[PDB]
Design an enzyme around this catalytic site. Structure first.
Site, PDB file in Angstrom:
ATOM      1  N   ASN A 146      44.299  67.211  97.857  1.00 34.71           N
ATOM      2  CA  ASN A 146      43.876  68.101  96.550  1.00 34.71           C
ATOM      3  C   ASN A 146      42.373  67.819  96.412  1.00 34.71           C
ATOM      4  O   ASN A 146      41.726  66.897  96.823  1.00 34.71           O
ATOM      5  CB  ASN A 146      44.458  67.169  95.715  1.00 34.71           C
ATOM      6  CG  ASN A 146      44.349  67.882  94.265  1.00 34.71           C
ATOM      7  OD1 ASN A 146      44.924  68.924  93.734  1.00 34.71           O
ATOM      8  ND2 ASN A 146      43.386  67.421  93.357  1.00 34.71           N
ATOM      9  N   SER A 149      40.861  65.561  93.165  1.00 29.77           N
ATOM     10  CA  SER A 149      41.528  63.991  92.786  1.00 29.77           C
ATOM     11  C   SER A 149      40.923  63.110  91.894  1.00 29.77           C
ATOM     12  O   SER A 149      39.650  62.634  92.303  1.00 29.77           O
ATOM     13  CB  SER A 149      41.231  63.517  94.327  1.00 29.77           C
ATOM     14  OG  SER A 149      42.090  62.302  94.531  1.00 29.77           O
ATOM     15  N   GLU A 383      49.572  60.111  98.871  1.00 28.09           N
ATOM     16  CA  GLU A 383      48.875  60.924  99.832  1.00 28.09           C
ATOM     17  C   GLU A 383      49.474  60.745 101.157  1.00 28.09           C
ATOM     18  O   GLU A 383      49.986  59.525 101.629  1.00 28.09           O
ATOM     19  CB  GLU A 383      47.328  60.568  99.813  1.00 28.09           C
ATOM     20  CG  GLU A 383      47.096  59.236 100.274  1.00 28.09           C
ATOM     21  CD  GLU A 383      45.481  58.844 100.507  1.00 28.09           C
ATOM     22  OE1 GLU A 383      44.773  59.751  99.769  1.00 28.09           O
ATOM     23  OE2 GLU A 383      45.030  57.911 100.616  1.00 28.09           O
TER      24      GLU A 383
END
Length: 689
Positions: A146, A149, A383
């Protein structure tokens, strides 16, 4: 027809995905699972966010309007209204995937319901709603999963005003990722503030900070090896951050003040070393020939350049009822020297940011009333790379605690509430409560208990530390490796850790120095004794929600940080919100089958559909089943007693049906196999023409 989801023509796994896809593909975002919310973040404007919609979801039930308000709230959020008590909401999902827009729903739902009249309400609500993208430009950074973040823990709290509107809230963080400043994977990029600040400020402003337009020249930006990013153009993006600087209330005066901290850090960062083998024998010391870097380091702090280096790089203690005379010397290796160097560089900025956001609320927060607090959770997301390491463990560890949270709530604390009411309930196949995954890293004889212990044993590097894991475990259930599980995918130095989802392998590079975290009171005290309105200001009024006793390794301090997160979540009435990402291309219409299917997989949601429910073929609710077959049963009219367990029995006993033939939990009715539905339809036919 068959609308929504719980009426599918073929109740199967495949049809569930095909439908869910058609749902999101037709502007049907919100979806329910028993009594849990499932939403997504379009990251743009959809024609479903106005005053009319918000006012619609208040004073009704779930089986009356489309998915959005989830009755569980209308019940629970009201259950504590009997006790006039406060609540808290938890949100999970991919990093920076709207956990920013998911909270918006809660707020947009909170207002109006809480409220109105006051011209100083809806107006200041704008600057508050613009506070989300505000903080997403300073503390946030980039990740391969992303872009937006967030890089700081956040447990927001919502208070209320006498008129109805909110008054303010506090913020709390933990740990803070602090290994990215010195190490990271190729292609990735460090914190935003270091790069966005360069491609923007006038050259004149840079020289004043003793800076040159060249990253390689420094150390803070050289530790990586990367400088220019292909996707990002900070030169243009800079104007978006500045528009957020002045608009809110951070004048250049306050900006420069904050920069004076980085200005120093950038003067301290240059302090590199040329492996000094000074000691004839003992241990290689650390020499700084280019002293102007170490000199400029103390120039900002305005402390004795000499004594500083003699009182930090060198440890000292005497003692005798007084408080010692600091001077004795302890030169140490480069690793420990670099460790101490960073250890301070991180915590210095961590405390500031958390004290900064509180001062951002100085022109926002109110201090007129004190009352109930509705909390909102928001932490780094799980993640996933094709190559993990230590820094991943901490993030992945939180998910192990997050799964424990639900099982503690949606499977334990809630089931105990069922029997407390005295309603039909029986323990249906309860999969492992996985308290082993908790005991495996808390009490003596546990991972972090065996890990943090090795962090102190400096003579136990990485290879020796590895051996303290494989032996301690690889026998306890739910943990594999190469040795036991003969799989070549696992290296001889790596291991296989099974989460509640899939499989992950970790490396070992830097494990110790990155994990130790040990921060003694030698690097901390220096700045405290300095003479500057900020240097000591970064260390705010001593003891903010964390006092007890100060002098002790941080290895235990961080352990307390996570314990302060769990204990406060157990004894309460949380609310569940989980979101899924449409696609990685931010496209409005494209669905990535593999990616989406994976998210539904590793989160174990369809399992809850077979557990939280109970597990079988065709499924229907009680609440939704009610308002449908009302005029087909006896004594199931508004004259009902209120007791569900007795109501359901009255529904079946008057038609003569065996007890075990059916199965009744709290919600969702369960009749095995379709043919039985005909058996019901017929049973009603041969009892009364």
């Amino acid at each position: 027809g068959v609308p929504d989801f719980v009426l599918l023509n073929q109740i199967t796994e495949n049809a569930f995905i095909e439908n869910l896809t058609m749902r999101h593909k037709s502007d049907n975002i919100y979806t329910y699972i028993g009594d849990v919310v499932i939403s997504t973040n379009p990251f743009k404007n959809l024609n479903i966010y106005k005053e009319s919609d918000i006012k619609a979801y208040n004073g009704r039930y779930k089986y009356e309007m489309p998915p959005h308000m989830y009755a569980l709230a209308n019940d629970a959020y009201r259950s504590m209204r009997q006790s006039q008590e406060n609540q808290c909401v938890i949100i999970s999902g991919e990093s920076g995937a709207g956990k920013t827009e998911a909270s918006k729903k809660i707020m947009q739902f909170l207002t109006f319901v809480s409220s109105n009249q006051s011209p100083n309400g809806e107006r200041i609500s704008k600057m508050l709603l613009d506070s989300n993208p505000l903080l997403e430009a300073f503390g946030n950074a980039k990740t391969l999963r992303n872009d937006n973040s967030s890089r700081f823990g956040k447990y927001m709290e919502m208070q209320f005003n006498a008129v109805g509107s909110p008054i303010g809230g506090k913020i709390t963080n933990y740990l803070l990722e602090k290994s990215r400043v010195v190490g990271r994977t190729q292609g990735e990029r460090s914190f935003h503030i270091f790069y966005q600040m360069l491609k923007g400020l006038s050259q004149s402003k840079l020289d004043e900070l003793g800076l040159t337009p060249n990253a390689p020249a420094y150390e803070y930006l050289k530790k990586s090896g990367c400088f220019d990013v292909s996707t990002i153009d900070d030169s243009g993006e800079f104007k978006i951050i500045v528009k957020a600087m002045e608009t809110l209330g951070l004048k250049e005066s306050d900006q420069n003040s904050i920069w004076r901290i980085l200005a120093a850090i950038l003067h301290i960062g240059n302090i590199t070393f040329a492996e000094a083998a000074e000691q004839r024998t003992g241990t290689t010391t650390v020499k700084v020939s280019d002293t102007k870097s170490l000199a400029a380091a103390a120039s900002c702090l305005k402390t004795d350049q000499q004594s500083l280096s003699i009182a930090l790089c060198y440890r000292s203690i005497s003692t005798g009822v007084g408080k010692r005379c600091e001077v004795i010397s302890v030169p140490m290796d480069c690793n420990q020297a670099a460790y101490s160097r960073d250890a301070l560089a991180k915590a210095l900025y961590e405390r500031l940011f958390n004290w900064l956001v509180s001062k951002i609320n100085t022109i926002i927060n109110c201090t007129t009333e004190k009352g109930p607090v509705i909390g909102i959770l928001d932490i780094y997301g799980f993640e996933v790379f094709q190559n993990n390491s230590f820094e991943q463990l901490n993030i992945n560890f939180c998910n192990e605690k997050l799964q424990q949270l639900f099982i503690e709530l949606t499977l334990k604390s809630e089931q105990e509430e069922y029997v407390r009411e005295g309603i039909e309930w029986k323990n249906i196949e309860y999969f492992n409560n996985k308290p082993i995954c908790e005991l495996i890293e808390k009490k003596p004889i546990g991972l972090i208990s065996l890990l943090d212990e090795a962090c102190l044993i400096a003579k136990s590097t990485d290879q020796t530390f590895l051996d303290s894991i494989c032996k301690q475990f690889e026998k306890n259930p739910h943990l594999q490796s190469y040795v036991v599980s003969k799989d070549r995918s696992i290296g001889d130095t790596c291991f296989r850790l099974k989460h509640y989802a899939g499989d992950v392998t970790y490396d070992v590079r830097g494990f110790l120095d990155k994990n130790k975290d040990t921060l003694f009171g030698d690097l901390i005290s220096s700045m405290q004794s300095s003479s500057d309105p900020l240097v000591q200001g970064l260390f705010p009024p001593t003891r903010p929600e964390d006092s007890k006793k100060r002098p002790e390794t941080a290895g235990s301090q961080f352990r307390n940080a996570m314990n302060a997160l769990i204990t406060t979540l157990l004894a309460c009435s949380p609310h569940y919100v989980r979101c899924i990402k449409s696609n990685d291309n931010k496209q409005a219409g494209v669905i990535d089958e593999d990616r989406v299917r994976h998210q539904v997989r590793y989160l174990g949601l369809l399992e809850n559909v077979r557990v939280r429910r109970a597990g079988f073929a065709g499924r229907i609710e009680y609440t939704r089943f009610y308002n449908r077959y009302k005029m087909l049963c006896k004594k199931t009219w508004p004259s009902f007693n209120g007791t569900a367990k007795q109501a359901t029995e009255l529904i079946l006993q008057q038609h003569n049906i065996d007890k075990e033939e059916i199965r009744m939990g709290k919600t969702k009715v369960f009749i095995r196999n379709p043919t039985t539905l005909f058996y019901f339809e017929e049973k009603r036919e041969l009892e009364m023409p």
